[PDB]
Amino acid sequence: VDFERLASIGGIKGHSKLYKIKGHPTTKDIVIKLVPNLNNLTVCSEMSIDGYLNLINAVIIPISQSLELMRNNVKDGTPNENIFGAIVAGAALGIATAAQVTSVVALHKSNQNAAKINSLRDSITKTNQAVEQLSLGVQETVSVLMGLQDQINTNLVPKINILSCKQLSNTLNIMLLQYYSQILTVFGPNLRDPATVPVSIQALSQLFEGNLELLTSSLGISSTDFNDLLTGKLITGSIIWADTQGHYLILRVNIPDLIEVPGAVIQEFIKIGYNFGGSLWMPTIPNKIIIRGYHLSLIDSTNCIITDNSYVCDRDYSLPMNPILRECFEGNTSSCGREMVLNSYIPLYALSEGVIYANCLATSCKCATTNKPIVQSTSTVITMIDNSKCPVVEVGKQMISVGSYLGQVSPNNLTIEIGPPVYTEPVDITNQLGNINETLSKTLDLIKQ
Amino acid sequence: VDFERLASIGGIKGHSKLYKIKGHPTTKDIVIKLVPNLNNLTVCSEMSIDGYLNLINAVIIPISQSLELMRNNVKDGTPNENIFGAIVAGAALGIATAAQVTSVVALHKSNQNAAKINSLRDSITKTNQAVEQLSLGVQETVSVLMGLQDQINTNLVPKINILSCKQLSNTLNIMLLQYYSQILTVFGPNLRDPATVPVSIQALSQLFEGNLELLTSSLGISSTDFNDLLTGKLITGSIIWADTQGHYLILRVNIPDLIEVPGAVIQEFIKIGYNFGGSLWMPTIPNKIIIRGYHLSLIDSTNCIITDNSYVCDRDYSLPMNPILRECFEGNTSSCGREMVLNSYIPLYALSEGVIYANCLATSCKCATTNKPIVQSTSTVITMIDNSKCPVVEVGKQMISVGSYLGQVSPNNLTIEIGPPVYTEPVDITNQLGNINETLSKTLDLIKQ
Amino acid sequence: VDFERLASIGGIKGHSKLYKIKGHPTTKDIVIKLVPNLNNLTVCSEMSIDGYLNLINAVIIPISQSLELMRNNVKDGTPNENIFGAIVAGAALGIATAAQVTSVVALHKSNQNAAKINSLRDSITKTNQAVEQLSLGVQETVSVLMGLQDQINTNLVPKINILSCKQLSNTLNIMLLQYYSQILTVFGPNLRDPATVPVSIQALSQLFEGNLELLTSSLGISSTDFNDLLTGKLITGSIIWADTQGHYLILRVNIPDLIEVPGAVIQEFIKIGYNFGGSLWMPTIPNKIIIRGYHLSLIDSTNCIITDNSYVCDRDYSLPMNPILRECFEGNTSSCGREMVLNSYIPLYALSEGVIYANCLATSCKCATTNKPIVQSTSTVITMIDNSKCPVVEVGKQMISVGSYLGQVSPNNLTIEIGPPVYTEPVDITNQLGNINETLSKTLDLIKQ
């Protein structure tokens, strides 16, 4: 890429940041209970828990049935001693994809640990606090949790005798209906196929009043640097057991790790408007260019957080680009398109290493040190301001200082090769393909002559 | 649609679902009280209600004057000779659509029931609980409802003498300001034209801590199956009255239904990457094809929820394709477009009726029962794998089992034909336009002579 | 623009509203403290504040360091003959934009007032109420506030001795993790550079349970008409100080004003389907047209709220419109394009000042004064209906009355030109990609002839 020619056409080189992709995740098993274990409220709680039980058993049972169905198709013990592993009975599958097979293999791998955690069902159902830990093994422990367990251990407990029992039953019914609305909201897409659908950690967090940090801390991840504090919205987890007896859900989550792709640097750009042909124009370039070993491609940070120093993505998002755009970035400013604007929010000046790139035709350019106006050149449109002209500069309204030097090439004396203009592209451009069509079927009429 | 040549072009036939959408327009009517009724707080409440009342008086009166204007835009009379009424006022609508006329007919249809509900205004204001059902007639009822009644019947009521009265007044002001912010949030677009704008049941439930099925069970809808349980976001409804003295809003909602359009089957597809020209490609076909008696249309599930077995839409969303797409799906794989990718997240193999469609040029394909590689034929690009080759297949890393049979013919032994790709960013269409600019007078240079 | 031919192609003139732009905002300074001042809880608080402080220091300290680092890059003083201008040291900026320069100038303006507010740090940290005021000067005041100060002044305070101190400590821990997650949620993009990123009042109010007009009333701005009730989602604020001692942020917010651009009228339109060629077609014209002294342009309401009488935007969003669309709106219905629709939710009739535009080919049309049907003319598709034919009209299933007159000339008796249909696919481009290439040999063939 040539920054001098692309600055001649009106694009200024922005920051350079890194690219990091999530990769190599380890697994951790969590358990979530659903039944609010009340021990203090055995005086006045009545039958009303069983209505909540009937409403949650409408969704606990079919998820568990599909979960035991999907783990039933796979088997182990490949024929021959040389070949061994998990075998998917694809005749019993019907239609399946690669990630579904991978999830089936993962569930078959975690079936033994699911049975190991299922051995502690009475330990799961005996908890009376919000979040606590129980000894899974000699070195492993579980992370049982309920957000609403605290709500009938710090709010509804002290009103055990001041307030009437039917009012406690009605308030518990309102809270249970609201919580069942929350579980109904979060396990929406999970109802179709609860094996191949990951669970967002924030969607888990709205079950517990939107506290993602409690799940992050009790899960074990402790973000310390600046880069991992923004990260935490990409933690994925899958359900491995859906037990109906204690009415609990055993899930397996993936602890992320931000690996770094070698040699890939994300380069940003700033687009300014320039006055050509009596109109204001902007070059048509993408904002972000990934560069890796003299190779230009495209990415999208639609799902990626952007730090001050790097681009952090959940997964690699490499998109191809047109070779005409590659020639536009490399040498050919004639191959770069331009669009027109007339709105008031167009930047005309910007700073780059102490060098001002400014359109002086619309912006007032002056030097404070000499008190003389600066005129637009006719060989260029974008006008540079450095310490060669004047140190202390009047641009627009503002006093500024400049610094450094162009380095290699001055685009003031360089020729101008602004390419063809493009228009706006709504469904209007399909109507211009329509009048291109009538021009072409005029030429088809002129073919026969 | 032929699935063998569509498997040759790179598409795999996915699941088949239904289009059981829309239903009978049975309705129901409820009452939304705004001012909460305090009865235990007659000791220490001051006149903190007056600021809330002055805040809501700026809201309630415009909807009331708009609705009485809208009733002034219609009469019935008995003009003509066969017509016994239901005429609209001439030119009093100004600018109006068909849905506005339908809303006019709806208010003229329900004004008698609105007067019937308004006959018990003193019965409306005497409620001191959250949700009540009061008898409209002999076998009829409505639902008067106040979700913040509980918060000043279980939280602010017991602190009547423990906490100081000015602190209760301040906290009451805080929750009144918060709840008035909630009404200002939910009746945002409703303030412009409060007769033709429906009300989302989820945004209505957001006034009540997001307890949707509390409103649903108080309404009367009891979804019992899997398909209708996810449904409940298609309730909707329109306000029929905005009474100022009781400060309440009489709402009319529609009880939905799920009828089935006959013969319409939604078909899913899986698009895999194939290695042609030393490059990775995918075919360009839409994901869902609706088929009804040899008729292909297009749909968009931008709002429709997807069940495990069918598609639930609020309303029919039929779209067409080009006839070139119809020939692409029927017989012409040369008319099916393609796209080039280089990203890592491209699946290359999938399963369909125990038959593997695999890109073995990039995927390791072996038979574990015989320990031999599976090689790509030069005639095919996508490899069919069944039990005729080998029962246990190594694909990728995984042991899998195949089964069933082929189905008519195979896609491997068929001829393959392909076409050019194209993308967005119409600067290439701009160069094509300049090509037309030079081309049309490239024609009229040396035709004759 | 005409409305006779434009309704003859099927577009009906909607309401005419105004255009207003937010302009000239003044500045007011607020302060936001973050450490919850507990005074009643000195009996049982333990050291749970220390973990919250350790969590929030990693956010507070680098924001303050970046703020003072950006503060160092601007200097004042006289550049020889010029008096002042706040000279920006451009060597200490790297790459900067115009908005960043304006923000640096804003903080250079606000350093003195930030120091004046920072002189009352012990006054800031001593507040034990939710929202209260302190005297900044003889005529200026500050607006120190918390949404969660009340929560440990009305909820956790009365359970000082009834509930155990470790349960109070755990409840405070859970609520502090939840609120620390709230600050991590709202200050997401602010951590990259906390000077150039504006702060929305909505996400700020999300820290205080979504009570927007509590913040608005503490600011002092008050809405009084219909147009300012919907306005309230566009308040812009910027960080001016990030003090780590009392752990508070001094913020400067911009109280706005809705200025009116003169002569600009936003025109809406209603597009109906018309039956041509045995099929339903939809004309392709934009819904909104801004007209200002015979000047058509394009706008987008992607962020602008729409009131009953005007358009309220955060900033001007004028876009150029095509000269082919200028011929479409002025004279040439051939330039007005079309598309082919088949879905059932297409309106075919509408009312405009007692003028019925009705496609009577698909809609039943009658006059029950005479009890006869109304037929379709061959010279037009859209049916003109006024009181000259019959004053009381039957359209579809609805019985209406009309008035007024035609409007200059009737839109039924003329003949209008037509545009071609379009689609939403790049297939056409690929067609031409080889088409013009094939027709190129044909052009030379004409030359050969």
Ligand SMILES: *[C@@H]1O[C@H](CO[C@@H]2O[C@@H](C)[C@@H](O)[C@@H](O)[C@@H]2O)[C@@H](O[C@@H]2O[C@H](CO)[C@@H](O[C@@H]3O[C@H](CO)[C@@H](O)[C@H](O)[C@@H]3O)[C@H](O)[C@H]2NC(C)=O)[C@H](O)[C@H]1NC(C)=O
């Ligand atoms: C999940 O897998 C289990 C285990 O069965 C094994 O896997 C199947 C896929 C087949 O390949 C089996 O041959 C294989 O053993 C299946 O559970 C089994 O279900 C059957 C009924 O389908 C049960 O038989 C019943 O048993 C008693 C006998 O007294 C009577 O009630 C009935 O007469 C009937 O025969 C059987 O006990 C049960 N268990 C075992 C170990 O075979 C299961 O069908 C399968 N699928 C699902 C969806 O759960």
Ligand SMILES: *[C@@H]1O[C@H](CO[C@@H]2O[C@@H](C)[C@@H](O)[C@@H](O)[C@@H]2O)[C@@H](O[C@@H]2O[C@H](CO)[C@@H](O[C@@H]3O[C@H](CO)[C@@H](O)[C@H](O)[C@@H]3O)[C@H](O)[C@H]2NC(C)=O)[C@H](O)[C@H]1NC(C)=O
């Ligand atoms: C909505 O409609 C009511 C009812 O009036 C009926 O509908 C109107 C659209 C017109 O077609 C009327 O002719 C028709 O009766 C309107 O309320 C009426 O408003 C008028 C004033 O516009 C009232 O007249 C006043 O009455 C007393 C007489 O002592 C004095 O205060 C005034 O001198 C004045 O004459 C009238 O009483 C009232 N009611 C009726 C039954 O006619 C209403 O104006 C209309 N529009 C709106 C915007 O509310």
Ligand SMILES: *[C@@H]1O[C@H](CO[C@@H]2O[C@@H](C)[C@@H](O)[C@@H](O)[C@@H]2O)[C@@H](O[C@@H]2O[C@H](CO)[C@@H](O[C@@H]3O[C@H](CO)[C@@H](O)[C@H](O)[C@@H]3O)[C@H](O)[C@H]2NC(C)=O)[C@H](O)[C@H]1NC(C)=O
């Ligand atoms: C922000 O600015 C302050 C003020 O410094 C002034 O502005 C800077 C932008 C430069 O132009 C300075 O020349 C100018 O004075 C900076 O504080 C200063 O930091 C320096 C170190 O960077 C301190 O020097 C130290 O001082 C003592 C001397 O006994 C010893 O510890 C060291 O040997 C060392 O020399 C200096 O005292 C201090 N104050 C002043 C008034 O200069 C500050 O660093 C700067 N930037 C940031 C990121 O905070």
Ligand SMILES: *[C@@H]1O[C@H](CO)[C@@H](O)[C@H](O)[C@H]1NC(C)=O
């Ligand atoms: C409440 O429950 C706790 C925990 O089980 C127990 O220690 C306490 O004694 C109970 N109190 C009453 C009054 O039941």
Ligand SMILES: *[C@@H]1O[C@H](CO)[C@@H](O)[C@H](O)[C@H]1NC(C)=O
């Ligand atoms: C593009 O640039 C190359 C050198 O980088 C040059 O040879 C070529 O002619 C240019 N093409 C244009 C300006 O169209």
Ligand SMILES: *[C@@H]1O[C@H](CO)[C@@H](O)[C@H](O)[C@H]1NC(C)=O
């Ligand atoms: C640009 O070229 C001019 C002559 O046109 C020359 O005076 C000037 O020094 C050049 N600038 C450079 C090489 O930076």
Ligand SMILES: *[C@@H]1O[C@H](CO)[C@@H](O)[C@H](O)[C@H]1NC(C)=O
């Ligand atoms: C293109 O033009 C031809 C000839 O006028 C017309 O028949 C055809 O429908 C048009 N096609 C498209 C896709 O615009």
Ligand SMILES: *[C@@H]1O[C@H](CO)[C@@H](O)[C@H](O)[C@H]1NC(C)=O
């Ligand atoms: C509180 O209100 C309820 C319901 O109206 C009533 O039964 C009760 O007596 C009231 N209590 C007091 C102390 O006013």
Ligand SMILES: *[C@@H]1O[C@H](CO)[C@@H](O)[C@H](O)[C@H]1NC(C)=O
């Ligand atoms: C595929 O075609 C080949 C010849 O090209 C033939 O030998 C083979 O039997 C065919 N397989 C089918 C029809 O399944």
Ligand SMILES: *[C@@H]1O[C@H](CO)[C@@H](O)[C@H](O)[C@H]1NC(C)=O
């Ligand atoms: C290209 O330009 C104009 C429109 O700008 C068009 O009318 C003309 O036919 C085209 N060709 C030439 C040779 O100008």
Ligand SMILES: *[C@@H]1O[C@H](CO)[C@@H](O)[C@H](O)[C@H]1NC(C)=O
């Ligand atoms: C609680 O704090 C308030 C306000 O500072 C004070 O008036 C009151 O005495 C305190 N009460 C106790 C029990 O400490």
Ligand SMILES: *[C@@H]1O[C@H](CO)[C@@H](O)[C@H](O)[C@H]1NC(C)=O
């Ligand atoms: C466009 O309209 C003008 C008058 O406004 C007319 O002279 C001209 O012929 C029209 N052009 C068409 C229909 O192509």
Ligand SMILES: *[C@@H]1O[C@H](CO)[C@@H](O)[C@H](O)[C@H]1NC(C)=O
């Ligand atoms: C429409 O044209 C007819 C002649 O075809 C004429 O009689 C009639 O008055 C016209 N209507 C107008 C101009 O409104």
Ligand SMILES: *[C@@H]1O[C@H](CO)[C@@H](O)[C@H](O)[C@H]1NC(C)=O
């Ligand atoms: C059409 O011709 C142009 C110019 O030679 C070429 O760039 C383009 O690839 C061709 N398109 C096809 C599909 O052959």
Ligand SMILES: *[C@H]1O[C@H](CO)[C@@H](O)[C@H](O)[C@H]1NC(C)=O
């Ligand atoms: C497919 O069949 C159609 C006729 O139905 C034909 O026009 C097309 O060329 C065929 N596909 C080929 C040979 O590319």
